[PDB]
Amino acid sequence: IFRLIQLVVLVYVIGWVFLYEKGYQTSSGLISSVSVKLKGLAVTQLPGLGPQVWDVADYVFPAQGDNSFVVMTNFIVTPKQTQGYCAEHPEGGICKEDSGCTPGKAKRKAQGIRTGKCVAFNDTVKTCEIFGWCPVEVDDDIPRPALLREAENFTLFIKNSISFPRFKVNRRNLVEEVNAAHMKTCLFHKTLHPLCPVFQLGYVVQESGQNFSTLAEKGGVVGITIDWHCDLDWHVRHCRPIYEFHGLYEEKNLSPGFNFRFARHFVENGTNYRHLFKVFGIRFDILVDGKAGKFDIIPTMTTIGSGIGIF
Amino acid sequence: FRLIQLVVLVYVIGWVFLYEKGYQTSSGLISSVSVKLKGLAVTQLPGLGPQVWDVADYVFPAQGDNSFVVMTNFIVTPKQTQGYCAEHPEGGICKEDSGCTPGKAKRKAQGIRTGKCVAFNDTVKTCEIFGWCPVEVDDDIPRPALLREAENFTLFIKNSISFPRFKVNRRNLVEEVNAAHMKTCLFHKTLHPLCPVFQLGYVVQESGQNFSTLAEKGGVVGITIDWHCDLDWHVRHCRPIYEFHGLYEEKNLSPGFNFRFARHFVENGTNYRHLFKVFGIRFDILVDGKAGKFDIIPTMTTIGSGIGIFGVATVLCDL
Amino acid sequence: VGVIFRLIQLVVLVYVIGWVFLYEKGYQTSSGLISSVSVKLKGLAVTQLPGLGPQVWDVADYVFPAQGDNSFVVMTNFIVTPKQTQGYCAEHPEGGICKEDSGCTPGKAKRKAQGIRTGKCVAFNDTVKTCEIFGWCPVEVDDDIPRPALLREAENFTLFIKNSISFPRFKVNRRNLVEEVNAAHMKTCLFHKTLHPLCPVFQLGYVVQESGQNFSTLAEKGGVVGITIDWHCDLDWHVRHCRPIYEFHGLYEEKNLSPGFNFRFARHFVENGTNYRHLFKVFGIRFDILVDGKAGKFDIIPTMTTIGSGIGIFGVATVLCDLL
Numbered sequence: 001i002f003r004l005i006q007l008v009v010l011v012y013v014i015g016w017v018f019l020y021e022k023g024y025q026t027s028s029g030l031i032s033s034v035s036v037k038l039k040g041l042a043v044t045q046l047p048g049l050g051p052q053v054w055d056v057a058d059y060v061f062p063a064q065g066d067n068s069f070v071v072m073t074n075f076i077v078t079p080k081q082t083q084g085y086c087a088e089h090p091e092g093g094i095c096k097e098d099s100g101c102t103p104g105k106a107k108r109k110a111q112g113i114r115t116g117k118c119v120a121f122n123d124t125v126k127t128c129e130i131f132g133w134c135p136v137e138v139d140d141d142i143p144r145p146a147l148l149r150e151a152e153n154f155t156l157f158i159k160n161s162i163s164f165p166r167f168k169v170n171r172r173n174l175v176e177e178v179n180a181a182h183m184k185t186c187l188f189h190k191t192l193h194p195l196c197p198v199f200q201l202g203y204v205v206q207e208s209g210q211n212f213s214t215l216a217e218k219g220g221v222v223g224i225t226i227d228w229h230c231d232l233d234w235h236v237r238h239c240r241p242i243y244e245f246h247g248l249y250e251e252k253n254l255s256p257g258f259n260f261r262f263a264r265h266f267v268e269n270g271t272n273y274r275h276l277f278k279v280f281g282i283r284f285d286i287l288v289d290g291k292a293g294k295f296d297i298i299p300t301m302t303t304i305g306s307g308i309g310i311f
Numbered sequence: 312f313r314l315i316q317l318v319v320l321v322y323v324i325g326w327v328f329l330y331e332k333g334y335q336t337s338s339g340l341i342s343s344v345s346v347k348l349k350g351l352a353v354t355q356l357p358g359l360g361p362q363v364w365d366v367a368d369y370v371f372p373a374q375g376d377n378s379f380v381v382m383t384n385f386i387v388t389p390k391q392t393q394g395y396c397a398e399h400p401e402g403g404i405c406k407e408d409s410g411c412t413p414g415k416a417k418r419k420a421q422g423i424r425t426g427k428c429v430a431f432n433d434t435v436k437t438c439e440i441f442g443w444c445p446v447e448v449d450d451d452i453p454r455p456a457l458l459r460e461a462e463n464f465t466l467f468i469k470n471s472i473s474f475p476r477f478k479v480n481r482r483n484l485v486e487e488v489n490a491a492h493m494k495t496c497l498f499h500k501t502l503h504p505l506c507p508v509f510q511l512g513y514v515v516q517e518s519g520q521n522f523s524t525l526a527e528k529g530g531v532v533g534i535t536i537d538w539h540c541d542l543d544w545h546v547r548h549c550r551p552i553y554e555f556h557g558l559y560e561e562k563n564l565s566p567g568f569n570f571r572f573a574r575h576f577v578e579n580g581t582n583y584r585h586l587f588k589v590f591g592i593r594f595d596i597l598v599d600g601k602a603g604k605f606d607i608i609p610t611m612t613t614i615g616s617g618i619g620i621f622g623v624a625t626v627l628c629d630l
Numbered sequence: 631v632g633v634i635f636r637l638i639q640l641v642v643l644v645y646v647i648g649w650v651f652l653y654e655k656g657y658q659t660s661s662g663l664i665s666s667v668s669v670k671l672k673g674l675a676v677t678q679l680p681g682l683g684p685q686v687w688d689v690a691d692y693v694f695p696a697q698g699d700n701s702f703v704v705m706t707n708f709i710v711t712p713k714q715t716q717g718y719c720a721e722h723p724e725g726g727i728c729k730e731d732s733g734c735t736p737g738k739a740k741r742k743a744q745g746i747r748t749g750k751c752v753a754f755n756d757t758v759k760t761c762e763i764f765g766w767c768p769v770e771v772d773d774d775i776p777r778p779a780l781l782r783e784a785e786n787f788t789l790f791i792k793n794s795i796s797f798p799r800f801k802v803n804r805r806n807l808v809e810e811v812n813a814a815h816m817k818t819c820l821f822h823k824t825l826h827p828l829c830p831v832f833q834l835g836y837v838v839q840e841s842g843q844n845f846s847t848l849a850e851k852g853g854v855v856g857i858t859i860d861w862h863c864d865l866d867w868h869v870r871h872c873r874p875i876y877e878f879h880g881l882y883e884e885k886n887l888s889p890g891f892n893f894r895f896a897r898h899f900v901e902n903g904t905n906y907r908h909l910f911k912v913f914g915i916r917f918d919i920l921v922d923g924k925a926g927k928f929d930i931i932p933t934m935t936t937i938g939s940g941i942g943i944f945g946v947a948t949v950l951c952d953l954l
């Protein structure tokens with residue numbers, strides 16, 4: 001009758017609501033601690049006087065190794081910068097006489113305070129004098145060898161530690177079920193080697209949907225997410241992380257890039273100088289998330305009440 | 312009782328159903344924030360030549376993470392080397408050179424002590440230490456702030472987000488206009504809410520803090536970007552909301568934000584350093600939002616919950 | 631029979647609903663928070679090395695993030711390779727030992743990335759043959775951890791933590807520094823899990839100690855120590871009862887965390903128009919600070935939902951009564 005028909009629907013409806021979509025499991029949070037170490041040397045040299053060597057202490061800009069590192073792939077350097085009077089970059093002034101520019105800092109993009117003098121910048125152009133980091137103004141042009149292109153083969157290591165807030169279950173990225181592979185020499189693969197934490201930069205960039213040849217010329221942002229999905233309805237094992245290299249690029253306005261400017265201030269015979277670097281590098285962002293969940297009497301009671309209650 | 316309970320039950324269940332969006336499955340987000348600052352601060356000190364500070368100098372760190380510090384004032388102690396010199400007067404004052412507990416002091420540590428004390432000629436006489444000499448004297452904070460031009464500096468926040476389990480990603484920098492109009496906008500809480508370029512003076516002011524007192528001693532300003540949108544409507548309606556918080560309601564005056572960093576250099580084989588006491592404004596940018604799309608399972612759960620509540624009304628009415 | 635069954639069902643309904651309400655605390659509308667924590671370190675570490683001159687380390691030296699972050703390094707040991715010239719040197723024997731002339735031509739080798747070779751071989755130690763590479767060339771980094779930590783005096787350093795939080799949903803904000811601001815006892819406290827539970831956590835040695843990590847082992851080569859701040863206060867009570875709870879974690883199980891934390895760090899300088907470098911192998915203790923909590927408020931909509939949430943006991947109380 002009506003009662004018999006409603007009884008069958010109740011179990012089937014509650015089966016998907018509570019017997020399938022958890023509810024009998026107490027979901028908890030997580031506390032993560034990810035430390036990243038790189039392994040690579042980029043000796044590409046320059047078309048000038050002598051080669052150059054870039055070790056891990058040079059291209060990984062957060063030295064302490066934050067979860068968001070800015071590993072360098074290209075740069076342009078203006079060496080021996082000192083505060084003085086010289087010719088302004090033509091981006092601001094193209095004067096032909098002393099009346100072209102007025103003394104004082106410009107109301108718009110300026111490189112320093114002007115004393116006021118239309119001096120020679122060479123390059124068959126004339127500009128007005130300024131005071132600032134002015135042995136020569138920085139000239140911006142992205143090189144096209146992709147200077148630190150050897151970073152494509154650079155190696156990451158994203159060992160992560162999970163502790164959970166109250167379940168007192170400690171798990172980490174290095175499962176070590178095979179004892180560090182017993183010969184090391186593993187590279188991560190979304191199909192072949194999904195448990196190897198030694199992702200390569202080229203693979204990381206490629207699996208994000210971007211092109212490294214474009215990300216080694218200008219900058220780029222790559223997101224890596226580690227997701228923990230502990231169930232604790234089984235042995236303490238079988239809980240492993242899942243890495244997703246996100247992209248963030250999609251379509252957008254092509255590839256905007258990512259560059260930042262940093263300086264190396266040094267000192268000489270009485271005066272202070274500066275090595276100005278315009279750095280184009282790929283920024284890797286690491287975000288760890290977890291779900292967890294363990295059996296408890298209270299969630300089961302709440303489900304057995306609401307399940308009957310929903311009737 | 313059936314007529315009265317049915318009218319009431321439908322109303323209360325509908326309130327839980329419609330207003331609370333019980334049929335909607337919310338989801339998290341993953342975001343990346345990149346900040347670009349433009350502006351030059353000229354702090355020509357009286358009695359000497361000018362000194363400019365470009366973005367490579369007053370931004371800590373240079374990479375510009377979510378929590379970055381913009382220098383607004385500083386005290387510099389140049390040419391510091393490890394050697395024998397007198398203590399700062401706030402460590403103790405000699406009357407005779409009968410030691411000052413040679414070795415590291417138990418309370419005020421600035422270098423190991425030698426037991427013989429010389430004249431620190433601020434009318435006082437401290438005791439010799441081995442450490443970074445000369446000793447920093449940061450009693451007088453430069454007032455007004457040296458980098459007063461930081462008020463007009465513009466902060467450009469470029470936040471790009473993506474909603475997991477929905478395959479939708481959006482950027483706070485809205486793609487609706489081109490240059491000469493997107494490169495002219497300045498943010499305003501009412502006039503230009505969608506403009507992503509913020510001015511430091513406006514950001515500090517909108518947090519309830521005075522920039523004049525927040526530049527000399529520093530401060531902490533929090534910027535929150537909130538992505539509160541639903542996927543039921545068109546994705547063009549998903550827009551960010553910017554709110555600036557004066558963290559800890561700036562107490563009453565607050566000590567401000569300050570830190571010490573050094574520039575180490577070598578002169579004739581000797582290691583020196585430039586000690587800086589940086590008074591800057593720390594900006595914290597945290598992005599969080601919730602979004603969802605209609606699905607069959609949340610609707611079924613809401614229907615089951617509402618139908619059960621109607622049955623509870625009949626049971627209560629039966630009493 | 632029916633009346634008694636209905637009375638029993640009502641009694642058990644009331645009992646379970648009351649127990650759930652006293653347990654679930656669902657009538658409170660919990661919300662997130664906005665966190666802001668700033669750390670101040672106070673301590674001087676003096677180092678003694680073979681020579682006539684000691685060395686001191688200011689806070690601007692062993693705190694590597696400098697400007698301060700949630701995660702920071704408080705380095706307690708280091709190895710320094712000074713005056714790196716970036717020229718032609720002898721590669722480290724770890725990369726490879728040559729014989730006669732096995733330079734194998736430049737090309738940065740296959741597994742030993744130490745500059746680019748040159749096809750010539752000359753060395754420094756009793757292994758007098760190790761190939762000639764082009765790179766930072768005072769000497770290759772011969773790193774051995776000093777058994778007594780150089781900055782072992784960091785166990786007495788102070789870690790003044792100033793946490794500012796806010797609840798935007800209910801427009802309430804609190805600070806790590808508890809009520810009765812300033813007044814007496816100026817800078818005369820020290821955090822203890824039982825004796826002094828309300829004062830910013832200090833004494834790095836004690837912070838490492840309250841994680842089962844044996845700072846003496848952590849000073850030489852140790853690594854990450856986690857600090858968690860949980861507020862967990864209900865705003866229905868007085869707002870002065872909302873206080874932080876500090877918990878220190880280890881995030882370790884003694885499997886591969888024994889090497890701890892280390893990172894390279896370089897100081898570049900110029901002498902006679904030549905770029906040089908001071909390479910540091912820095913062994914430090916990383917401190918991570920994580921803050922979270924839920925406030926909750928009485929309101930009316932959560933009360934209505936909990937009344938609806940209480941329909942679980944009242945849903946099939948009569949429906950299941952006739953079944954049995």
Ligand SMILES: CC(C)CCC[C@@H](C)[C@H]1CC[C@H]2[C@@H]3CC=C4C[C@@H](O)CC[C@]4(C)[C@H]3CC[C@]12C
Pocket residue numbers: 019024233234
């Ligand atoms: C016990 C009843 C009343 C509670 C609800 C039962 C359902 C939801 C749950 C509770 C305990 C669960 C079991 C717990 C442990 C395991 C071990 C695993 O190798 C297979 C699944 C299995 C066998 C689970 C199957 C589903 C299960 C039976």
Ligand SMILES: CC(C)CCC[C@@H](C)[C@H]1CC[C@H]2[C@@H]3CC=C4C[C@@H](O)CC[C@]4(C)[C@H]3CC[C@]12C
Pocket residue numbers: 334543544545605
């Ligand atoms: C009659 C049944 C199916 C109603 C069940 C409630 C749900 C499915 C209804 C209630 C309100 C509805 C929404 C109301 C308004 C809009 C905005 C419009 O631009 C697209 C459709 C959309 C997004 C509707 C989708 C369907 C919707 C979410």
Ligand SMILES: CC(C)CCC[C@@H](C)[C@H]1CC[C@H]2[C@@H]3CC=C4C[C@@H](O)CC[C@]4(C)[C@H]3CC[C@]12C
Pocket residue numbers: 866867868928
């Ligand atoms: C309205 C009744 C019948 C049903 C709901 C009960 C609610 C309103 C009751 C149950 C428990 C109560 C709380 C119990 C204890 C305290 C601590 C006291 O220092 C302030 C009031 C406060 C915070 C009460 C506020 C009101 C409260 C939340």
